[PDB]
Amino acid sequence: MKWDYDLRCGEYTLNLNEKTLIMGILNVTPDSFSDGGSYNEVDAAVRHAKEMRDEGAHIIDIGGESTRPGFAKVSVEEEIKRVVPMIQAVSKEVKLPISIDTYKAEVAKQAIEAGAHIINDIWGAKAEPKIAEVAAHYDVPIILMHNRDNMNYRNLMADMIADLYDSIKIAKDAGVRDENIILDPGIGFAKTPEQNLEAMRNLEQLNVLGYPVLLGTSRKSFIGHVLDLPVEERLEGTGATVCLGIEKGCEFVRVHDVKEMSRMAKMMDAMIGK
Amino acid sequence: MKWDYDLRCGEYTLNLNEKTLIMGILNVTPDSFSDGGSYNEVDAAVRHAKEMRDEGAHIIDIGGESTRPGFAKVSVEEEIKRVVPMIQAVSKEVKLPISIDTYKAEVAKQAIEAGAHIINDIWGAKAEPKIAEVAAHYDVPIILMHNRDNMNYRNLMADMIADLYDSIKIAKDAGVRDENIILDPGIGFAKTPEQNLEAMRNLEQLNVLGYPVLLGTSRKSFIGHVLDLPVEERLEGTGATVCLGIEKGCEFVRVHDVKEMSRMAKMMDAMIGK
Ligand SMILES: NC(=O)c1ccc(SC(F)(F)F)cc1
């Protein structure tokens, strides 16, 4: 009942009421010597995508080098060379909606022509506002993530909701329809460990804006800060964050460990009555 | 702030505010040919206890054959022969509070003399009311679990709270102090799969009775019913139930997989601000 529309992802449709949707994380393994497109690079990407599809992923999230976790300085002409061949191949042989992980307008634009269905922006359309227009033009869902270039909060949650609505304004002024807007609390970004725990504890507040919320906490540093555990041993901590996130009404979770998280989400959904 | 007393377990003290307490499950591996006490049986019990202590367990729960999951018909004279040597050895070389898993008064009584600190009753003092007196006499914490011999609920939750308070009455009429009372929703017992999901979803209601709540969902059938997964693949489902349980204010979780659940509980505590 909570949502009265389905997420329209070109040729795939995502119901927001039946279950928590699992977005699986695919990071490029760049080939040295080449700028992209090579067989090993692309085929490792496809095999990874297929594994995630089998493990219960509903969306595949595809990131280049300029995005997380790398954040390397690459121009858009090269990032296209790399990210486009992956999107052409994955979209061809894995029938799932694909989101492009970029804050760059031209990269988002190429990705969608290559065959991406959703835009996923870590800067909430603030780094390159034209990205909002790209989304409006192609009529695709855009994920707006909370992020700032500083740590200076008067009031964390109120500041987050304010910051986010600034993103919504930019998106809607560009012509993006409400149904194509998704929000993300930006856990792990521009927050102290203490502020990350705080945002998690108060996540249900994001619900007042009236948009589906995607949660992305997978293997993040704050989990390590709490448990005192390296990145490879953060499965149980990520699981907690996913369970809490779902209890507090999130519609997507973005995770590396698709099998495990998928199982937890399904148990949560059964319990909270999704 | 929520609790203004500590759980007094003889020589160990359990703070109910700092963190979710993990009770690790130890089931006897009975030796054929002997009635109990043999070296392999007892030493496997000790090694298991030590493993759980290292994995982060705060309490060791020790069950004989007449209790779960076996429920075999054994007299109390034999159950004592088996459960007492385990309790003497574990209490000797694992410095943790030990709970005896029994609904039988004489068994509880022997267990405590042998060195058990807490009584854990799956029948909520209704099967053998004298167990309440045993607890009152020795001044030990008693866990009262919801259980009935039928499935006939007018209103699940109201019926559960009613049933439980009937247990509290029997306990207090025997002389058990409020601080020595703990409650358990009896998930997996006398409930359909649908009713188990319901009790989980409405667990916070148990809080109104004003007693610490222990949650025990580890590897239970309903998790299997939801995920469609055999008992060995229920880690992720148990994890969900533990996370939800903690969100809804439970003070203990009783689990087989101490390492994993301990990590999840610790992440939950950090998030909900315990
Ligand atoms: N490979 C495993 O047995 C394993 C270990 C830990 C986890 S984390 C959990 F259970 F989801 F919370 C999952 C699977």
Which ligand 1 atom sits nearest the alpha carbon of residue A260? 11
> A270, B239: Cβ pair inside 8 Å?
no
> A271, B227: Cβ pair inside 8 Å?
no
CA B242 to chain centre: 14
Q: Phi and psi (nearest 5°) for A224?
A: -65, -35
Among B226, B264, B272, select the one facing A236 at the smallest CB separation: B264
Give the residue from chain A lying closest to B248, CA to CA.
A247
A88 near A114, Cβ under 8 Å?
A: yes
> Which residue is catalytic, options B53, B126, B219, B254?
B254
Mark residue A119 as left, alpha or beta (left: phi above 0; alpha: psi -120 to 50; beta: remaining).
beta
Residues of B in contact with A223 (CB under 8 A): 267
Task: Compute the distance between CA of residue A169 and CA of residue A122 in angstroms, rounded to an integer.
Answer: 16
Task: Compute the distance between CA of residue B16 and CA of residue B9 in angstroms, rounded to an integer.
Answer: 12
Beta-ladder partners of B83: none
How many CB pairs lie under 8 A apart between chains A and B?
83
3-class secondary structure for chain A? Answer: CCCCCCEEECCEEECCCCCCEEEEEEECCCCCCCCCCCHHHHHHHHHHHHHHHHHCCCEEEEECCCCCCCCCCCCHHHHHHHHHHHHHHHHHHCCCCEEEECCCHHHHHHHHHHCCCEEEECCCCCCCCHHHHHHHHHCCCEEEECCCCCCCCCCHHHHHHHHHHHHHHHHHHHCCCHHHEEEECCCCCCCCHHHHHHHHHCHHHHHHHCCCEEECCCCCHHHHHHHCCCHHHCHHHHHHHHHHHHHCCCCEEEECCHHHHHHHHHHHHHHHCC
Q: How was this structure determined?
A: X-ray
Q: Are β-strands B21-27 and B252-255 bridged in parallel, bridged antiparallel, or unpaired?
A: parallel
Count of positions (residues) in chain A: 274
Task: Compute the distance between CA of residue B3 and CA of residue A269 in angstroms, rounded to an integer.
Answer: 31
Task: Compute the distance between CA of residue A33 and CA of residue A31 in angstroms, rounded to an integer.
Answer: 6
Q: State the DSSP H helix or E strand holding residue B100, giving kind and residue range, or none if neither.
A: strand B98-101
Residues of A with CB under 8 A from a CB of B: 197, 200-201, 223, 226-227, 229, 236-237, 239-241, 243-244, 247, 260, 263-264, 266-268, 270-273
> B239, A243: Cβ pair inside 8 Å?
yes
Residue nearest to atom 11 of ligand 1 (CA): B236
Q: Is residue B154 helix, strand or coil?
A: coil
Give the residue from chain A lying closest to B274, CA to CA.
A201
Min CA distance, B157 vs chain A (Å)?
15
The data reach a resolution, in angstroms, of: 2.2
Nearest residue to A153 (alpha-carbon basis) of A186, A104, A120: A186
Question: What's the count of helices (H) and strands (E) in chain B, helices before strands?
Answer: 9, 10
Which ligand 1 atom sits nearest the alpha carbon of residue B238? 10
Could you count the other beta carbons within 10 Å of the beta carbon of residue A210? 10
> B264, A200: Cβ pair inside 8 Å?
no
> What is the dihedral angle through the alpha carbons of A162, A163, A165, A171, rounded to the nearest 10 degrees?
170
> B272, A201: Cβ pair inside 8 Å?
yes
Domains contained in chain A, CATH given: 1-274 (3.20.20.20)
User: B197 CA distance to ligand 1 centroid (A)?
Assistant: 22
Task: Compute the distance between CA of residue A62 and CA of residue A102 in angstroms, rounded to an integer.
Answer: 9
User: A85 CA distance to ligand 1 centroid (A)?
Assistant: 34
Min CA distance, B226 vs chain A (Å)?
7
Task: Compute the distance between CA of residue B140 and CA of residue B182 in angstroms, rounded to an integer.
Answer: 11
User: B235 CA distance to ligand 1 centroid (A)?
Assistant: 6
B234 is catalytic: no
Q: Are β-strands A7-9 and A12-14 bridged in parallel, bridged antiparallel, or unpaired?
A: antiparallel
Q: State the DSSP H helix or E strand holding residue B96, giving kind and residue range, or none if neither.
A: none
Q: What are the C-alpha distances in Å from B191 to residues A222, B151, B198?
A: 38, 6, 10
Q: Is residue B26 helix, strand or coil?
A: strand
Letter string b/e over residues B74-113, b meaning 16 or more CB atoms within 10 A of that residue's CB: bebeebbbbbbbbbbbbbeebebbbbbbbbbbbbbbbbbe
B7 near B95, Cβ under 8 Å?
A: no
Contacts (Cβ under 8 Å, ≥6 apart) of A18: A274
